[PDB]
Amino acid sequence: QRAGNETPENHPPLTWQRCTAPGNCQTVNAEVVIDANWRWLHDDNMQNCYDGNQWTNACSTATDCAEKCMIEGAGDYLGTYGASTSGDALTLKFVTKHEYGTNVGSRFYLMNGPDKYQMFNLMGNELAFDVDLSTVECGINSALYFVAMEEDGGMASYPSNQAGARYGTGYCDAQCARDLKFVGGKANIEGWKSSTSDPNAGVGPYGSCCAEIDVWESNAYAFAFTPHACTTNEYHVCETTNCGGTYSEDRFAGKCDANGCDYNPYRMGNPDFYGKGKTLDTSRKFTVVSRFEENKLSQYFIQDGRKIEIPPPTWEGMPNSSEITPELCSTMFDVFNDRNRFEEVGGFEQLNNALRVPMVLVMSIWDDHYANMLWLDSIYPPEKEGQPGAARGDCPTDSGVPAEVEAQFPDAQVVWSNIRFGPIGSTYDF
Ligand SMILES: OC[C@H]1O[C@@H](O[C@H]2[C@H](O)[C@@H](O)[C@H](O[C@H]3[C@H](O)[C@@H](O)[C@H](O)O[C@@H]3CO)O[C@@H]2CO)[C@H](O)[C@@H](O)[C@@H]1O
Numbered sequence: 001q002r003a004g005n006e007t008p009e010n011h012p013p014l015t016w017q018r019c020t021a022p023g024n025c026q027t028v029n030a031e032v033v034i035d036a037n038w039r040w041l042h043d044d045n046m047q048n049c050y051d052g053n054q055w056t057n058a059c060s061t062a063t064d065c066a067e068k069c070m071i072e073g074a075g076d077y078l079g080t081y082g083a084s085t086s087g088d089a090l091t092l093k094f095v096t097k098h099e100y101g102t103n104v105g106s107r108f109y110l111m112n113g114p115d116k117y118q119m120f121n122l123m124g125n126e127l128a129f130d131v132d133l134s135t136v137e138c139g140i141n142s143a144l145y146f147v148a149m150e151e152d153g154g155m156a157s158y159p160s161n162q163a164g165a166r167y168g169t170g171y172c173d174a175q176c177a178r179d180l181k182f183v184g185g186k187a188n189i190e191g192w193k194s195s196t197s198d199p200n201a202g203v204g205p206y207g208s209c210c211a212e213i214d215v216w217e218s219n220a221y222a223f224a225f226t227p228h229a230c231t232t233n234e235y236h237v238c239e240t241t242n243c244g245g246t247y248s249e250d251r252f253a254g255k256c257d258a259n260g261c262d263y264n265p266y267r268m269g270n271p272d273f274y275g276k277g278k279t280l281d282t283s284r285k286f287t288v289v290s291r292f293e294e295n296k297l298s299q300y301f302i303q304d305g306r307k308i309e310i311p312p313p314t315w316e317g318m319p320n321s322s323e324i325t326p327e328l329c330s331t332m333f334d335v336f337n338d339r340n341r342f343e344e345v346g347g348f349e350q351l352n353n354a355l356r357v358p359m360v361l362v363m364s365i366w367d368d369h370y371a372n373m374l375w376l377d378s379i380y381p382p383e384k385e386g387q388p389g390a391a392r393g394d395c396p397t398d399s400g401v402p403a404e405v406e407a408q409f410p411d412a413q414v415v416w417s418n419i420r421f422g423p424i425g426s427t428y429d430f
């Protein structure tokens, strides 16, 4: 899909820092871009190629939708989407009201120049960030993660898209982004079915698949550290039958891990470790440094200067430790009562061969129509409960309801900042 010129594209700048050794790094004058699903699509004589949850008569097929339509700069990222950067801090607003619309959650990808998002060599180094989710309530996911999208935006891989990373095209994770309106520069209009609760969404035929490492899926009641690996980690397209994820009737259908191997302290048997008032106090802002080693992913916090280690798990027959190692991913499933995709798609070796694939840093805040963040902040699937693995937070299973938590605390915000990247133990000294 080409680009439309009714709106110029202006990426807020977001400073991060490249480290070499402790108490010494190097800043990074970066910028930021919003995922391409939030912009406007039209044709030459102006009018939507996609209005609301449905496509338009203007469009007819995967191909002629890319040679006919185009995407647009985001207008003012602040007033239209709650987007707002301040030096090193990227604020993101959950519920934003404007003249004639209503943006709901968004996605942002660290850049390198207005043409390229910034690629990331994880395996052997670590990533850290300050985060203030203190008003991110039950049902919202204020997210920070890596998903191997392409460098330029997939523009050379699929030149039907001449917008490229320039306009947030190209998003892919490990659930096959079936919701995107374009994947591999083709429009997902053919057979596009509209959402049943999301007035802005729909699920497409093609999804955008690749690997995903979920350093931080959360809000102030619980967090989760979840990598996910694929039979091919790199960007890649699934086709209807060969699509799994939330968006296809067969979750584990395709080449990827949609569940991956999480570590949620609460889920692992420690209730009182993370929240408002807990050891890790989420009422206040903190530091989450996280590491990448073959067969090991470590993640520690810094609150009020102090190092805070996450508690090892509790239940019998689980590893002694908190680290995401293949002993975990193995054992996790001998008692957590869940389908082991992890071993299916390659086990922790395949993830390590995923830890070496070029990645890009997404920061985000969203609510989830298919499960109301049930899987993150409480007991899910809320079909019995009282088993190992179901309780995953301190939220009642009433919450997360899209419309509802959109009305209860619509000032909710995540605040992303003070990013640090480099070899293991460079970003801090704990
Ligand atoms: O001008 C076009 C409209 O874009 C709106 O953005 C919505 C997008 O249409 C939609 O693709 C995006 O989908 C999100 C979804 O909100 C979220 O629940 C899910 O977790 O991720 C999806 C990824 O596609 O929703 C946004 C939210 O609005 C603008 O907000 C709107 O002003 C504008 O009319």
Ligand SMILES: OC[C@H]1O[C@@H](O[C@H]2[C@H](O)[C@@H](O)[C@H](O[C@H]3[C@H](O)[C@@H](O)[C@H](O)O[C@@H]3CO)O[C@@H]2CO)[C@H](O)[C@@H](O)[C@@H]1O
Pocket (backbone or CB within 6 Å): 143, 145, 173, 175, 214, 217, 226, 246, 251, 258, 259, 260, 262, 371, 375, 380, 381
């Ligand atoms: O943040 C990026 C992506 O998040 C995805 O959320 C998935 C989580 O990564 C995963 O931990 C969770 O696993 C659930 C599984 O859905 C469910 O079948 C089972 O009962 O509980 C598992 C954990 O115990 O899956 C969610 C999706 O439901 C988004 O799916 C993805 O679109 C987004 O980019």
